[PDB]
Amino acid sequence: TFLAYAQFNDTEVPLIEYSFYSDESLQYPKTVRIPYPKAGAENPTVKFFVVDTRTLSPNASVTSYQIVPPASVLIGDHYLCGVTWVTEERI
Amino acid sequence: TFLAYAQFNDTEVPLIEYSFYSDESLQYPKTVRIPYPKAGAENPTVKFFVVDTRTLSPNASVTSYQIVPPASVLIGDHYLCGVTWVTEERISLQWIRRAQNYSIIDICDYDESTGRWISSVARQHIEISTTGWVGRFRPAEPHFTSDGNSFYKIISNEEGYKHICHFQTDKSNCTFITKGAW
Numbered sequence: 285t286f287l288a289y290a291q292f293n294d295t296e297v298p299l300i301e302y303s304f305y306s307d308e309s310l311q312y313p314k315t316v317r318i319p320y321p322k323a324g325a326e327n328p329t330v331k332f333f334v335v336d337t338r339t340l341s342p343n344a345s346v347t348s349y350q351i352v353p354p355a356s357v358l359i360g361d362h363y364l365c366g367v368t369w370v371t372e373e374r375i
Numbered sequence: 376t377f378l379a380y381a382q383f384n385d386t387e388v389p390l391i392e393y394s395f396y397s398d399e400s401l402q403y404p405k406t407v408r409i410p411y412p413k414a415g416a417e418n419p420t421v422k423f424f425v426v427d428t429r430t431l432s433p434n435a436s437v438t439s440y441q442i443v444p445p446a447s448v449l450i451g452d453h454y455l456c457g458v459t460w461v462t463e464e465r466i467s468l469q470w471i472r473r474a475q476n477y478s479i480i481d482i483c484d485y486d487e488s489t490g491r492w493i494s495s496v497a498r499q500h501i502e503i504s505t506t507g508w509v510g511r512f513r514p515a516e517p518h519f520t521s522d523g524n525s526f527y528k529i530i531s532n533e534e535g536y537k538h539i540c541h542f543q544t545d546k547s548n549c550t551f552i553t554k555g556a557w
């Protein structure tokens with residue numbers, strides 16, 4: 285019935301950058317860039333959504349609900365570390 | 376339960392512009408700009424949506440469904456000209472081609488399992504004019520029975536006179552209930 289998913293936002297996470305040389309034919313090395321938070325750095329933020337797939341249709345909007353963490357976690361930086369479907373109506 | 380609304384898009388409609396002088400204290404006149412389609416110009420486009428208000432919540436997206444006109448109208452420029460709620464699960468939409476000599480009523484039913492509003496050829500009613508335009512200024516509106524199984528609507532007689540015709544929601548032929556040179 286439902287499709288739950290997480291969205292990660294790495295906008296403020298610093299980028300680690302390093303050269304990748306590739307095949308010998310590549311004249312100029314490329315630079316790989318990855319949002320990677322080192323100790324104490326700005327972290328990705330996360331949002332969790334539950335989509336009701338019963339209404340998905342070409343001319344319908346997506347019915348979705350955002351589930352936010354409890355106040356004791358919402359307070360500061362946090363991570364979503366687990367998801368378990370219990371029944372069709374409980375997550 | 377539902378809130379239906381139309382969205383008008385005037386992106387490509389040219390603007391009429393004219394000066395507005397305002398109070399004598401205004402040192403420089405203002406230029407008013409309005410998207411206004413003159414004869415033959417690009418027209419606004421329309422989208423019709425039905426919103427299910429039951430799910431409205433700050434942390435929820437909006438649940439809505441766009442109902443498009445029937446194929447014979449969707450085919451070219453058109454206008455939405457009428458919206459009539461029949462029951463909580465049936466809505467009547469009246470569309471008209473830009474030429475305005477061909478209109479169609481599309482009666483859509485809410486499908487509880489998917490939230491879609493479904494149309495069917497059996498529930499569509501066409502009104503055309505070979506000698507002019509449809510209706511007086513626009514096609515007349517349908518007046519449904521409590522159950523929504525039929526409706527009454529003013530249309531032109533075989534004699535050219537506007538009279539009340541009785542339609543079955545799922546049948547194409549109607550029966551005139553009034554007649555005469557008036």
Ligand SMILES: *[C@@H]1O[C@H](CO)[C@@H](O[C@@H]2O[C@H](CO)[C@@H](O)[C@H](O)[C@H]2NC(C)=O)[C@H](O)[C@H]1NC(C)=O
Nearest residue numbers: 382383384385386387388417418419420421422
């Ligand atoms: C309003 O209508 C205009 C078209 O007149 C839409 O603009 C187009 O948008 C798509 C998707 O963003 C682009 O690929 C096209 O290039 C745009 N065309 C032009 C001429 O701008 C616009 O998206 C519509 N707006 C809404 C909210 O429906």
Ligand SMILES: *[C@@H]1O[C@H](CO)[C@@H](O)[C@H](O)[C@H]1NC(C)=O
Nearest residue numbers: 291292293294295296329331
């Ligand atoms: C991602 O986070 C940035 C702030 O760091 C914010 O400006 C932006 O809107 C977010 N993007 C989305 C889609 O949530």
Ligand SMILES: *[C@@H]1O[C@H](CO)[C@@H](O)[C@H](O)[C@H]1NC(C)=O
Nearest residue numbers: 342343344441442443449494
């Ligand atoms: C969805 O809308 C498009 C026009 O935007 C139309 O071609 C299509 O038939 C619609 N889908 C259905 C099945 O109603």
Ligand SMILES: *[C@@H]1O[C@H](CO)[C@@H](O)[C@H](O)[C@H]1NC(C)=O
Nearest residue numbers: 350351352353432433434435
């Ligand atoms: C909706 O999101 C807000 C975010 O501030 C949160 O406070 C609220 O608890 C959420 N709704 C509920 C109770 O699920």
Ligand SMILES: *[C@@H]1O[C@H](CO)[C@@H](O)[C@H](O)[C@H]1NC(C)=O
Nearest residue numbers: 474475476477503504505506
């Ligand atoms: C409606 O008017 C257009 C002219 O814009 C014409 O092409 C078409 O044949 C007319 N249709 C009818 C039913 O008279």
